[PDB]
Design an enzyme around this catalytic site. Structure first.
Site, short mmCIF file in Angstrom:
data_model
loop_
_atom_site.label_atom_id
_atom_site.label_comp_id
_atom_site.label_asym_id
_atom_site.label_seq_id
_atom_site.Cartn_x
_atom_site.Cartn_y
_atom_site.Cartn_z
N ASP A 19 0.85 -1.18 0.00
CA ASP A 19 0.00 0.00 0.00
C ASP A 19 0.89 1.24 0.00
OD1 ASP A 19 -1.67 2.15 0.49
OD2 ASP A 19 -2.89 1.10 1.98
N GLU A 79 0.97 1.93 13.76
CA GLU A 79 -0.05 1.94 12.72
C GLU A 79 -1.24 1.13 13.23
OE1 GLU A 79 -2.30 0.54 10.36
OE2 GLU A 79 -0.92 -0.02 8.75
N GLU A 120 -10.20 -3.85 15.29
CA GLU A 120 -9.02 -4.54 15.80
C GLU A 120 -8.67 -4.10 17.22
OE1 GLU A 120 -5.62 -4.98 13.22
OE2 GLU A 120 -6.81 -4.52 11.43
N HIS A 160 -5.59 0.42 1.41
CA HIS A 160 -6.12 -0.89 1.77
C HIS A 160 -7.23 -0.80 2.81
CE1 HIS A 160 -3.45 -0.59 5.32
NE2 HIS A 160 -4.22 -1.52 5.84
#
Ligand SMILES: NCCCN(CC[C@H](N)C(=O)O)C[C@H]1O[C@@H](n2cnc3c(N)ncnc32)[C@H](O)[C@@H]1O
Ligand SMILES: NCCCN(CC[C@H](N)C(=O)O)C[C@H]1O[C@@H](n2cnc3c(N)ncnc32)[C@H](O)[C@@H]1O
Ligand SMILES: NCCCN(CC[C@H](N)C(=O)O)C[C@H]1O[C@@H](n2cnc3c(N)ncnc32)[C@H](O)[C@@H]1O
Ligand SMILES: NCCCN(CC[C@H](N)C(=O)O)C[C@H]1O[C@@H](n2cnc3c(N)ncnc32)[C@H](O)[C@@H]1O
Lengths: 343, 343, 343, 343
Positions: A32, A124, A133, A281
């Site tokens: 990406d 990140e 997540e 992405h």
């Protein structure tokens, strides 16, 4: 008895960290270019925030962000990683002759012990809709190692919401649930589950991109300051919204995207996943209403997007939307862990 | 009192004959060049079946068919018409100097008196799906005036049935019914009526044309012999069918059209409303299943199309279809009186 | 009853069969201007409803009764004569309002209501306001209205304006000239041309138009539903004197209507004017048999006389003359069977 | 239980959460080949079901139990461990089969059945037949089978065959060579290219292919479910000796399977072979690390060893050699993480 294990079911954690152990997934993220290039530009353009500094990279994966911090002159980088990718990161550190500056610490950032406090944390941690997540909480948790005068890259995060119209997408999902209306599938009557099926399909956030002309109002912004927020702030996230409709038509749901800002000493660098920007992405995320709402230009669409953290490292999303002039209301529940990838 | 009044509600009859009392509707039917031209060819090409014969024209309307019979040399044409159009037809008889051959009889063919038996009966009693308007029963009832060896134009009528696939039409009718799924239309929950709305929208036969490539099997033919049939035979029409599927996919319903044949002494002339043929004002008719049936090529689709004549000069259509190999069954009840004009 | 004495049975059957379809109720509910304006009028005047007794004349689906319930009414009598009453009762049950809304199946002229009400609500307007003759049921219902009660809508204004439309006027002769040919398949149709023209000119044209075809400010005829008697709607004489804003040929009169809800807090207006967004009433135009030339500044005077008939509609008699020239024209139209020209 | 001792908790949770989705049940039900063949097998052997007692191991939606009921079964115990059991119970009720079908929520290794059964039905086949290890549950359930009881399916055939596919082989290195670059954003990734190659080759490729890539007649390995025990499936040694019909480079082994329902009336086959219509199992290919050159007439001999793991899958070891040259190749594959290549 770590905060991670206390907020996460073991089955979810095992699957999560097995997924990030595959080099093919690391490759997918690294390729990406918008993400990887914007991170490198944020770190190198603000190289004085790293020069001779001590860095923590939360969830380093392959180590790419730690190498960027090393390129910027960091004195020492502690690269924490819980998956087996940690071993591949060590291999890259050795083959790139950076063993004296990048130290891989295998394990969860909530469970490892670091030898010193750090000047800056890099990570990140953004998922779909930013919050999927639940890695932002690991990012914020790691602030226990951050000096009082320390910084964080990214520094803030903006979630953008906007109403959209897309009859094709709405019909597409209803066509899938129509299977469970059949009165005689091979002689079996399925109709009794038609309700359960609609709920399940419309529980799926749709991950893909779209033309900006489907948006029916200026977006609403919800800002998370990573320097100020605490872990507990992300257990319940309430995002009120009031849209002033610019076009008339059916509102089939809300579209979501996010920006993060690296607020450095030299300049502020933005990483955007907006539909006006080059695709990443993360794409964009859309939550459908089980029934669309009609609104004319000048009407107001008001309501709340409530995200409740669950132990599967995701959120249960409650969206209530209301046309103020008519009382036309739509309530919806979405399971952010299991989206529909439409691209 | 009469056979017509006993099978017809007064309100339906009033509306029906008011409708055909409009010159604009007669113009509409006359400008169907395929219809009007084919009737003229059928009559003139068989001029020997009319030359110096006595003719009965059931429901002459403007009188066009009677004029064709006069062109073919008929000695005397009794033209029966129940609507106020009968007076306009008399105006045309006079202005065309055919008072010696065309005699307009105002009234219903089930109630008027004729001076003599006739050699041949002509009429255009076909409606949508052939049987709508129940004028075929008036056509057959007129045989009480037919000599033992007389003829009828048209002589036979073929109803064709075939399964079709058209997901856009199905979703279009589902989209309209989806209105009654709303949980908060201006604050009102309509969902309780979702079942009733779907039942109503899918009761409508869809009148329009379509590409022949949507048909998934060779059609099945049901023949009515107007020389042999009795009007009572049209109260309950049971059409069994067994299709051998040529293509695999979803069957969304059955498509209907009809052919009528003028079997004359000189030649047989066909008037077809098939989708392979030039379009007529009858178009074609499609009855949707509420839920589509899947079938693979080589499977057989069996069932029954049951048409029950009602007192509103139309039919209640019951279609039961089954994929024999799997037991997948689909049913639907349709109200032919009130179709959906999609063209 | 009063209803049966003014209505032919066949018209009544067709009329209430029509409104028994959910698709027709839906068509009217999806008119956002209509439904949204009614809701705004009721809710923005909440003090006119809170804890008060309401009568909803011709409730259909019940939507207006639900708005009255939203405003806080204590008891709503919802009267509906079509089979829609059964669907309305279903919605009252499914919205948990059986303690507040009582559905009464039948005609408001025939049912028995136990008590007087504080306010009557209804949507009885048809084309040109008066078509369908339901306003007489609305006014008839005032026998249940307290001396100090109110009416929603409170007043209705029908607007008349002269228009020029060369295409619309010529279209009638283009269609009628189908009959002016000496050999349509060998038949001379010309004797019926005049009858065809007369038939077309007797049909009011339902559609919308560019406001620039209007040649003078409209003339307004006001019905105050609080003071009017149902007998006031049997003969409606609308004298007009237009002051021409433009020079040209006047081909007929254009019709639209407004209604006003005069509440304690504010007056809300529902307009079907061509300057406003389109509604399912569109507008209505009635042609003169011959155009009248009128110069800007001239006066076009005459009368529009609406005469109720037993088909639940009106015979429209229009007489107009150019005062400065004496040029005179008239027409007599049948509003029960208009021509739907809109595309 | 036997299940809990062979399955890691994390895998079982994910496994049964997956099958708790109606969309996944729907995906399997919409495999017409699978669902239709099962129905044919049951209905065409009605004498193996009529008035019998049936056990459905992993009934999911219950479709197979309804097939057994259609065949006249006296009693069907349908066992399902996911939350889909609650949806199956809803279908048994709505299909008025509560007298014949008893849904038992739980794992077949843990529930208690009230009596012995005459026949066991199930669909336990995964990719390469054995994936998911559900066949062991199917065999375990034989503790409830009467001595003369039957199994539907009765036997399973695994077919192995060598293939040549230069494009598939090359794709692996094209993907892995992402890591063979000395400055990815300033980072040398080359040290991980070997690990990336290994990771990609460890993935069985799930898709379909032209049968002309096959280089020899398939070898067959049969499991007789009537005679086999759970333990027989923990270690599966498949020796093979291929006689090469074509010359070329052998890049790996292709896998597919058949099952046969051996009933009293007839044997019905369900095949996933590349010569048959496609199913949701497709076919599976395992690449060799190094291709082997073989001449037509040479012999390719070796062994495919499947070792079950506690992630409900298998570790695959393949060793092959060209007998006439001694050229040898190996590979180790993880059937749990396949590459879904189908487009
Ligand atoms: N779409 C989001 C990508 C997040 N991804 C970053 C990859 C790395 N920045 C790169 O680009 O190379 C997560 C990575 O961080 C790890 N991770 C998670 N949660 C903990 C945690 N609680 N402790 C330590 N590591 C974690 C995770 O295993 C994994 O490798
Ligand atoms: N598809 C059918 C419509 C054709 N329509 C004109 C046919 C005419 N040949 C022409 O082409 O102009 C029928 C006409 O027949 C009349 N009609 C009905 N039923 C009775 C009846 N029972 N008795 C007498 N006339 C009838 C009806 O009014 C009406 O005008
Ligand atoms: N454009 C005209 C209004 C249509 N419709 C409004 C429905 C509902 N109020 C809404 O606004 O959504 C009238 C309805 O009133 C009924 N109606 C008629 N005349 C009697 C009458 N005399 N008595 C009782 N009901 C009537 C008619 O059947 C019908 O459903
Ligand atoms: N090879 C694909 C199997 C798909 N699926 C069959 C569904 C239904 N019979 C159909 O044909 O459509 C498996 C289903 O069986 C269940 N299942 C598993 N293992 C246990 C087990 N050990 N005990 C009970 N159920 C099980 C599983 O949850 C799941 O729903």
């Amino acid at each position: 008895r770590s905060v991670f294990s206390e907020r996460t079911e073991e089955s979810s954690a095992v699957q999560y960290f097995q997924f990030y152990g595959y080099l093919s997934q690391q490759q997918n993220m690294m390729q990406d270019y918008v993400r990887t290039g914007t991170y490198q530009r944020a770190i190198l353009q603000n190289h004085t925030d790293f020069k001779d500094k001590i860095v923590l990279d939360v969830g380093c994966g392959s180590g790419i962000l730690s190498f960027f911090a090393a390129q910027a002159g960091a004195r020492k980088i502690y690269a924490v990683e819980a998956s087996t990718m940690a071993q591949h990161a060590e291999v890259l550190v050795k083959s790139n002759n950076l063993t004296d500056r990048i130290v891989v610490i295998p394990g969860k950032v909530e469970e490892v012990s670091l030898p010193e406090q750090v000047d800056i944390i890099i990570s990140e941690p953004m998922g779909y809709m930013l919050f999927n997540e639940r890695m932002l909480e690991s990012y914020l948790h790691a602030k226990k190692y951050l000096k009082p005068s320390g910084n964080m890259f990214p520094t803030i995060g903006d979630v953008h919401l906007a109403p959209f119209t897309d009859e094709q997408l709405y019909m597409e999902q209803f066509t899938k649930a129509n299977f469970w209306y059949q009165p005689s599938f091979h002689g079996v009557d399925l109709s009794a589950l038609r309700g359960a099926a609609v709920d399940e399909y419309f529980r799926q956030p749709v991950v893909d991109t779209f033309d900006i002309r489907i948006l029916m109002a200026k977006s609403v912004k919800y800002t998370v300051n990573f320097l100020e927020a605490k872990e507990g702030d992300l257990h319940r996230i309430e995002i009120p919204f009031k849209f002033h409709m610019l076009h008339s038509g059916l509102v089939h749901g809300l579209a979501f995207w996010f920006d993060v800002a690296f607020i450095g000493s030299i300049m502020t660098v933005w990483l955007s996943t907006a539909p006006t920007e080059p695709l990443t992405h993360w794409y964009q995320v859309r939550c459908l209403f089980q029934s669309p709402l009609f609104a004319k230009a000048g009407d107001t669409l008001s309501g709340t997007c409530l995200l409740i953290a669950n132990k599967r490292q995701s959120y249960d999303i409650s969206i209530v939307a209301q046309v103020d002039q008519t009382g036309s209301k739509s309530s919806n529940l979405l399971d952010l862990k299991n989206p529909f990838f439409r691209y």
